[PDB]
Amino acid sequence: MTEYKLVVVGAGGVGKSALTIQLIQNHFVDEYDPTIEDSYRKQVVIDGETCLLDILDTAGGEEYSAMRDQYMRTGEGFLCVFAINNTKSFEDIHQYREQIKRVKDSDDVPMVLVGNKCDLAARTVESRQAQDLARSYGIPYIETSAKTRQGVEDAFYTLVREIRQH
Ligand SMILES: Nc1nc2c(ncn2[C@@H]2O[C@H](COP(=O)(O)OP(=O)(O)NP(=O)(O)O)[C@@H](O)[C@H]2O)c(=O)[nH]1
Ligand SMILES: [Ca+2]
Ligand SMILES: [Ca+2]
Ligand SMILES: [Mg+2]
Ligand SMILES: [Mg+2]
Ligand SMILES: [Mg+2]
């Protein structure tokens, strides 16, 4: 069956792990344990196709950049995650995108921009601001909450649908 190798990137604390765990394991991780490099695999049906998702959950932050380079190399699509209550995380996105382009040696990599923590009310990144960034990259913008599950399947499945257009 078809395998989709997805990679989740973005600043520390934005919810990469919580998103992945919610998708794969159907619960919300409330605590914060920084990630080094974790993988999850699960068989799912997406648009009638039985397939295997292989999801790489990466370490966030400029300090782990070198480590990510090699682990990121076989990624077929990337979720670029910021949190809607963390302006710096949004400002950091372009650096993650640039890393992706470096590791894939391509300007045309399947990606989705994800604004996570949309259950929180202390919003400092407005939807339109993120829409505009995504538009510049030619990719979708989707908001998610790993806490409530809002948008979580949509984000990951949309990434699969972007891979399929490549
Ligand atoms: N309210 C709310 N909290 C969230 C959401 N997603 C993650 N969090 C919280 O934010 C914290 C960090 O989440 P985590 O997934 O560990 O972040 P990360 O991006 O994997 N960090 P790292 O790069 O260090 O591994 C946790 O306390 C988690 O519960 C969300 O959608 N809503
Ligand atoms: Ca929990
Ligand atoms: Ca390279
Ligand atoms: Mg993590
Ligand atoms: Mg503002
Ligand atoms: Mg398209």
Curated annotation (Swiss-Prot):
Locations listed in the record: Cell membrane; Golgi apparatus; Golgi apparatus membrane
Topology relative to the membrane, per the entry? Lipid-anchor
| InterPro entries from the UniProt entry | P-loop_NTPase, Small_GTP-bd, Small_GTPase, Small_GTPase_Ras-type
Q: Which residues carry this modification: N-acetylmethionine?
A: 1
Q: How is it modified after translation?
A: Palmitoylated by the ZDHHC9-GOLGA7 complex. A continuous cycle of de- and re-palmitoylation regulates rapid exchange between plasma membrane and Golgi.
Signal peptide interval: none
Linked pathology is: Costello syndrome: A rare condition characterized by prenatally increased growth, postnatal growth deficiency, intellectual disability, distinctive facial appearance, cardiovascular abnormalities (typically pulmonic stenosis, hypertrophic cardiomyopathy and/or atrial tachycardia), tumor predisposition, skin and musculoskeletal abnormalities.
Give the protein's function: Involved in the activation of Ras protein signal transduction. Ras proteins bind GDP/GTP and possess intrinsic GTPase activity.
* Protein's recorded name: GTPase HRas
Upper classification of the source organism reads:
Eukaryota, Metazoa, Chordata, Craniata, Vertebrata
